[PDB]
Paper text:
The bifunctional enzyme proline utilization A (PutA) catalyzes the two-step oxidation of L-proline to L-glutamate using proline dehydrogenase (PRODH) and L-glutamate-γ-semialdehyde dehydrogenase (GSALDH) domains. The two active sites are 42 Å apart and connected by a buried tunnel that is hypothesized to channel the intermediates Δ1-pyrroline-5-carboxylate (P5C) and/or L-glutamate-γ-semialdehyde (GSAL). The PRODH active site is located in a (βα)8 barrel, while the GSALDH module features Rossmann NAD+-binding and catalytic domains, which are both characteristic of the ALDH superfamily. Kinetic and conventional X-ray crystallography of PutA from Sinorhizobium meliloti (SmPutA) were used to capture high resolution (1.47–1.88 Å) structures of states along the catalytic cycle, including a novel FADH−-proline covalent adduct in the PRODH site, the intermediate P5C bound noncovalently in the reduced PRODH active site, the covalent acyl-enzyme intermediate of the GSALDH reaction, and noncovalent complexes of GSAL and the final product L-glutamate in the GSALDH active site.
The structure of the acyl-enzyme intermediate was captured by soaking crystals of the E810A variant in 40 mM L-proline, 1 mM Coenzyme Q1, and 1 mM NAD+ for 24 h and then flash-cooling the crystal in liquid nitrogen. Glu810 is the conserved glutamate in the GSALDH active site that facilitates hydrolysis of the acyl-enzyme intermediate, and mutation to Ala is expected to slow the hydrolysis step, allowing the acyl-enzyme intermediate to build up. The structure of the acyl-enzyme intermediate was resolved at 1.74 Å resolution. Electron density clearly showed the presence of a covalent modification of Cys844 in chain A. The electron density is consistent with the acyl-enzyme intermediate, which was modeled with occupancy of 0.83. The covalently bound GSAL is stabilized by the same interactions described above for noncovalent GSAL, involving the oxyanion hole, aromatic box, and anchor loop. Electron density for the coenzyme, either NAD+ or NADH, was also observed (occupancy of 1.0 in both chains). The coenzyme adopts the pose associated with NAD+ prior to hydride transfer (hydride transfer pose) and is distinct from the pose associated with NADH in which the nicotinamide riboside has withdrawn from the catalytic pocket. Given that the coenzyme is in the pose typical for NAD+, we have modeled it as NAD+. Interestingly, the ion pair gate is open in the noncovalent GSAL complex and closed in the acyl-enzyme.
Residue numbers in the entry: 14 to 78, 83 to 134, 137 to 491, 494 to 1230
């Protein structure tokens, strides 16, 4: 068999000294990067004065030389302007100019435009918003825009419509693009080519999703090289036109993880285009993209420049991004490569276009620092220093200075000195934007320095795809400052080098941008990830992973008295059974019962450890796991079948649980919050470290000793987690490990001294535990608390406003990551009928680009399922659907998978959602289509499964967001992003119905469930009072029940219903946390006062009730106000009147036990039950705790989804 990790992530080539200098600078501190940049960018006082003069002379011409004018002519509001442009865009999608004018004249200008024009008019309004207002809104308020469009048409008629159409036509055909086609762009370029300009054409392709998209982009590029070469007609690479390409357009898996495919499949295609450009002797420039593709692209640039088939041509070009901390070392490397190869490489120096996306990515991944600067002035100094380096090597490279900043331009112009010849260097600008400035530079009558115009080419659809990124003209852009008339010229010709030099601390990070580790401020330290695009990281990880596979991992029954003997068997890698991972010794049912007794007898000693010291253990346990992360990664990869990327996330999530529960402890717990006692923690195989650790850390920090029962498939990583927690100071008596199967779990739950159970697993097993536990009562006569986190049937809804490329990406990740073995995984994709065929073609194309196999290779996307039984179960489902006529799409599996348990990613097209009647825990996406008027019915079908865990929605339309998020009943919502990877303390995780009891893991109510008296969580309060509660309290006052009326009003104030908070997280995301009503609560009263207390508790938290008619208390609620009676029903057959969302029970100990057994028999969800005796209701106003009568909802909205980040102005 192949040696573990012997082929994890070998580099494309051995890393030269010059390449190593690049990698070493990836995330270098910003205070280290600047001093050498300032040294390099300095110039004589004489030069700086001449620079500021030239830069002032340029800026004064500009100030002395469209959509705004339209808004003025018709006195449009901002929303009218935006809506008018969306209307124009949709009228231009009408091809025949005469048909269009007839629709305007006879139907639009008069009738409701809403009849004549399956896709909102306002799909692109975020982009038109930028045009009109200069500000970017992530989503579209389509009801506001509809009203504005009606208003402006009813006011001004066909004339305003005509003017909108012509404006949009001019902007889309001549301003945003030089032309719609390359032939048209070439015809339009004649005029400025005569005035001394040159051109390079950008064909607006990028981010291929399928093989078909990449082939299409390739032939687009090929056919443009022909038109450009023919038009060039021998002018050469400096005077004549060239083309610019993006590598992500030519392959659907352009990434370091797929480097072998990139060199074998993408390189040959770039070489064939370059050969064509060589024959016409035109430039071919490789555009720069995200920071994690930079070094990968250098390997393509190296091979192309050493390829003798391309010799004799100096047209190959390459962009370098000055906002990147690697820029000067990249330039050293290129300059040396130009010397070795003898190719005069065309180096286009830009600042960079992905800034806010890079900030968000680094934060999300928990990396050590950013790969770009965080102050714009730092990018300027870097640009000017790299320009000096490039102007010293014009013998071997051709520098191309792409900038619109007049201060940068003047600096470069004077730095280059008096000698110039065409071919020494050039400036560059963007079509429609930079000509005014550079019409003051080009020509013998100005500065006599040439400028290449970068010219987008594309249809309306194409230009709009990333027209937002191109606009971002933000609060720090030179283009934005030259307009702003409160900015003086003296301000605009300020020298960035001298300003940075005289700052108190050179190169300081931006004050308002958090390093990834500091995302949560003083609350806690963020866990740290690893950069799998960093060759140094991959190299050192390769060795640690190899060394992890040599260990003899074991897991034993670690009882309080010491290791126990038992039945021993191997643990095999699910991706290859020949790979023995370790040995597990499993627990006898006798030692299971014995461990509970030792924990019971040791419980007082652990409760007596002060909360702050308990949390301090957890903080030490977090630090141990961060240090051992590489070794833990390797065990999770091989024991549980996970990819390295999913193993990193899992170890982070364990670290985060430990620090989050430690901080929550420091915020809440005191002497009056006593532990429950021994808690049994039972966990699933699919997050074998994270969920394992989170349940145990919570229970322990709340003062409870713990019996940890790991899933039988993943004991080894569990045993390691317990080793670490004990090393951190958890005493052996406080944390005992009991490996084994469901019998060991069932014996622990049943044991006499078990005070609480934390279960994560399947819904049916949680139903068996609930049944065990209804037989039992605590020594105080109350039910044994149960937290059950169970399965999901998670849907995503996509309408015709979504961007297919974003959707396919989020779907492929949500459904097939970890082979779909996430409780959160996407199970049902719901596609609006108009875009269903297009998205499904893309999805299937992207499916076939996934790599399935054993997960000790970075190249693997989808690993094995955990066992042969899981495989057989998943494959039964697939073949059933296949036998019912449903279209089934499956990738092909390589024969190497036969040594493991694999299921291929699978797409199944269903007719109705009720076709699918059970959670299928594998890589199996079901697809259904819906018509837009049936959206509300669709949300019902989603809710009707009974599950309620994760849910996703892709739309740009506020009315659809409002509608859908107010009707879906699920605990974790996701807008315009994937639906997996909830982050501790940011998206507190957990659902409702068949998906769990709550409270949410990694949320502020979790610890309260594990003590006898719940504390008040941080920020847990609400100023809102439920109005039916208030009517009930008045009814009680009317009936003479003064004391109960007062209790009712106190419950109204104590309720946290309506709490609405935003939680700190990464930039580019809004993460919200809210408390809602749970639903209909089953009330089982014994006395009239008991019923009034129960009803006040339920109403104060927004719930309706079903009251046990067998109680005989019907006459205690005569003459209810109508508002309260709407919320009240009576029930004789509890099972018929479900599903309920909780229960309140009054009785003595045996009444409680009987009612509890009858509630556990109700079909459907596990109910969170609270019981109290009549005397407890009288003595304790919190006998029924309001924390468990509300439902937590987490929502995460990707606010960078329109293409940029507004807040990072
Ligand atoms: C001809 C041509 C061709 C291209 C490009 C430009 C031109 C003129 N660009 C885009 C370029 O990188 C840049 O985004 C804009 O052109 C604006 O730069 P200026 O010098 O015009 O303006 P300006 O001088 O106002 O500089 C603005 C720039 O500063 C940076 N910035 C803003 N805030 C910052 C902060 N807080 N911290 C650090 N930096 C900050 C950004 O890079 C921003 O673009 C590009 N880009 C790319 O990545 N790949 C490519 O292939 C191209 N192609
Ligand atoms: N809501 C969540 O946060 C969440 C997270 C992960 C997984 N899950 C769910 O867990 C399931 C997959 O994991 P699984 O296959 O390991 O679950 P499972 O129900 O098969 O097994 C879970 C655990 O319970 C034990 N067990 C089995 N029978 C038992 C019994 N009669 N009494 C006591 N313990 C018993 C097992 O040994 C194991 O430790 C899926 O349904 C998935 O959706 C939910
Ligand atoms: C379920 O398996 C846990 C999944 C995790 N919380 C996530 O991916 O959100
Ligand atoms: Mg099982």
């Amino acid at each position: 068999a192949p040696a573990p990790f012997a082929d994890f992530a070998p580099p494309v080539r051995p890393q030269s000294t010059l390449r190593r200098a690049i990698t070493a600078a990836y995330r270098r501190p910003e205070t280290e990067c600047l001093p050498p940049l300032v040294e390099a960018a300095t110039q004589s006082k004489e030069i700086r004065d001449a620079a500021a003069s030239t830069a002032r002379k340029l800026i004064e011409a500009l100030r002395g030389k469209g959509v705004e004018g339209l808004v003025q002519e018709y006195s449009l509001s901002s929303q009218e302007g935006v809506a008018l442009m969306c209307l124009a865009e949709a009228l231009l999608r009408i091809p025949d100019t005469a048909t269009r004018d007839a629709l305007i004249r006879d139907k639009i200008a008069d009738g409701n435009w809403k009849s004549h024009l399956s896709r909102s008019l306002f799909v692109n309004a975020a982009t038109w918003g930028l045009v009109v207002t200069g500000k970017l809104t992530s989503t579209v308020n389509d009801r506001s825009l509809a009203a504005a469009l009606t208003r402006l048409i009813s006011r001004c008629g066909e004339p305003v419509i005509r003017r909108g159409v012509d404006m949009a036509m001019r902007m889309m055909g001549e301003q945003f693009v030089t032309g719609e086609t390359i032939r048209e762009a070439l015809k339009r370029s004649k005029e400025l080519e005569e005035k001394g300009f040159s051109y390079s054409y950008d064909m607006l392709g990028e981010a291929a999703t399928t093989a078909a998209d990449a082939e299409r982009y390739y032939r687009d590029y090929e056919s443009a090289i022909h038109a450009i070469g023919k038009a060039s007609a021998g002018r050469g690479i400096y005077e004549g036109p060239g083309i610019s390409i993006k590598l992500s357009a030519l392959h659907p898996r352009y990434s370091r993880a797929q480097a072998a495919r990139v060199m074998g499949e993408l390189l040959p295609r770039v070489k064939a285009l370059a050969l064509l450009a060589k024959n016409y002797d035109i430039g071919l420039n490789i555009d720069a993209e995200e920071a994690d593709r930079l070094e990968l692209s250098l390997d393509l640039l190296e091979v192309l420049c050493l390829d003798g088939d391309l010799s004799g041509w100096n047209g190959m070009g390459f962009v370098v991004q000055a906002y990147g901390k690697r820029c000067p070392f990249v330039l050293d490397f290129i300059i040396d490569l130009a010397r070795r190869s003898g190719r005069r490489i065309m180096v286009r120096l830009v600042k960079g276009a992905y800034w806010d996306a890079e900030i968000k990515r680094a934060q999300l991944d928990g990396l050590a620092d950013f790969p770009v600067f965080t102050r714009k002035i730092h990018t300027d100094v870097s640009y000017i220093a790299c320009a000096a380096k490039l102007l010293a090597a014009t013998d071997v490279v051709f520098p191309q200075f792409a900038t619109h900043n007049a201060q940068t331009l003047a600096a470069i112009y004077h730095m280059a000195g008096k000698d110039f010849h065409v071919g020494k260097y050039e400036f560059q600008c963007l079509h429609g934007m930079g000509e005014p400035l550079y019409e003051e530079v080009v020509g013998r009558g100005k500065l006599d320095r040439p400028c290449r115009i970068y010219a987008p080419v594309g249809t309306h659809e194409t230009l709009l795809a990333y027209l937002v990124r191109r606009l971002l003209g933000a609060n720090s852009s030179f283009v934005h400052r030259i307009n702003d008339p409160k900015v003086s010229i003296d301000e605009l010709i300020a020298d960035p080098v001298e300003v940075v030099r005289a700052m108190p601390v050179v190169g300081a990070k931006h004050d308002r941008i958090a390093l990834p580790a500091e995302l949560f401020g003083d609350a806690r330290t963020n866990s740290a990830g690893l950069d799998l695009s960093n060759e140094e990281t991959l190299a050192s990880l390769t060795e640690a992973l190899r060394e992890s596979a040599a260990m003899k991992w074991t897991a034993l029954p670690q009882l309080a008295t010491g290791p126990a003997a038992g039945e021993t068997r191997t643990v095999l890698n699910p991706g290859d059974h020949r790979d023995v991972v370790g040995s597990v010794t499993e627990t006898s049912e006798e030692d299971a019962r014995r461990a509970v007794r030792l924990a019971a007898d040791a419980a007082p000693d652990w409760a007596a450890v002060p909360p702050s010291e308990r949390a301090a253990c957890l903080d030490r346990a977090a630090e141990l796991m961060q240090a051992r992360m590489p070794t833990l990664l390797g065990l999770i990869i091989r024991e549980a079948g996970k990819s390295a990327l999913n193993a990193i996330a899992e170890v982070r999530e364990a670290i985060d649980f430990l620090r989050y529960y430690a901080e929550q402890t420091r915020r809440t717990l005191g002497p009056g919050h006593g532990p429950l006692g021994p808690i049994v923690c039972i966990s699933p195989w699919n997050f074998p470290l994270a969920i394992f650790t989170g349940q145990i850390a919570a229970a322990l920090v709340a003062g409870n000793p713990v019996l940890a029962k790991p899933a039988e498939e993943t004991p080894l990583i569990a045993a390691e987690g317990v080793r670490i927690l004990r090393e951190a100071g958890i005493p052996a008596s406080a944390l005992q490990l009991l490996p084994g199967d469901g019998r060991v779990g069932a014996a622990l739950v049943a044991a006499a001294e078990t005070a609480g159970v934390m279960f994560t697993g399947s819904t049916e097993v949680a139903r068996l535990i609930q049944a065990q536990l209804a037989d039992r009562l605590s020594p105080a006569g109350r039910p044994i608390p149960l937290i059950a986190a169970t399965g999901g049937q998670n849907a995503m809804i996509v309408d015709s406003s979504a961007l297919a490329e974003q959707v396919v990406g989020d779907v492929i990740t949500s459904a097939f990551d970890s082979a779909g073995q996430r409780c959160s995984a996407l199970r049902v994709l719901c596609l609006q009928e108009d875009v269903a065929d297009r998205i499904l073609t893309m999805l299937k194309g992207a499916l076939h680009e996934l790599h399935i196999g054993r997960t000790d290779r970075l190249s693997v996307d989808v690993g094995p399922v955990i066992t042969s039984e899981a495989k057989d179960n998943i494959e039964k489902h697939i073949e059933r659907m296949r036998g019912l006529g449903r279209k089934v799409e499956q990738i092909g599996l390589a024969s190497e998978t036969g040594v493991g348990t694999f299921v291929p990613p699978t797409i199944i097209e269903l007719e109705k959602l009720s076709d699918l009647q059970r959670e299928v825990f594998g890589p199996v996406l079901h697809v259904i289509r819906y018509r837009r008027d049936d959206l509300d019915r669709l949300v019902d079908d989603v809710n009707a499964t009974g599950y309620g865990l994760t849910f996703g929605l892709h739309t740009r339309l506020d009315e659809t967001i409002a509608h859908v998020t107010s009707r879906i009943k699920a605990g974790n919502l996701y807008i315009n992003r994937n639906i997996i990877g909830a982050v501790v303390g940011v998206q507190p995780f957990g659902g409702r119905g068949l998906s769990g009891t709550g409270p949410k893991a990694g949320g502020p109510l979790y610890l309260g469930r594990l003590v006898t008296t719940a504390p008040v969580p941080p920020q847990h309060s609400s100023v809102h009072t439920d109005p039916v509660l208030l009517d009930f309290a008045k009814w009680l006052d009317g009936k003479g029940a003064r004391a109960e009326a007062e209790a009712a009003r106190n419950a109204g104030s104590s309720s946290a219903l309506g709490l609405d908070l935003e939680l700190p997280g990464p930039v580019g995301e809004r993460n919200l946390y809210t408390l809602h009503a749970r639903g209909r609560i089953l009330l089982v009263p014994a006395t009239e006062s008991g019923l009034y207390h129960q009803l006040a508790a339920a109403l104060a938290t927004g719930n309706s009730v079903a009251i046990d008619a067998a109680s005989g208390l019907q006459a205690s609620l005569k003459n209810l106000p109508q508002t309260v009676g709407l919320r009240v029903s009576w029930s004789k057959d509890w099972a018929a009147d479900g599903p309920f969302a909780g229960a309140l029970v009054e009785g003595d100990a045996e009444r409680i036990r009987a009612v509890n057994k009858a509630i556990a028999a109700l079909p459907g969800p596990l109910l969170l039950v609270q019981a109290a005796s009549s005397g407890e209701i009288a003595r304790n106003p919190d006998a029924y705790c309001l924390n468990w009568l509300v439902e937590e909802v987490s929502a995460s909205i990707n606010t960078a989804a329109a293409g940029g980040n507004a807040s990072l102005m």
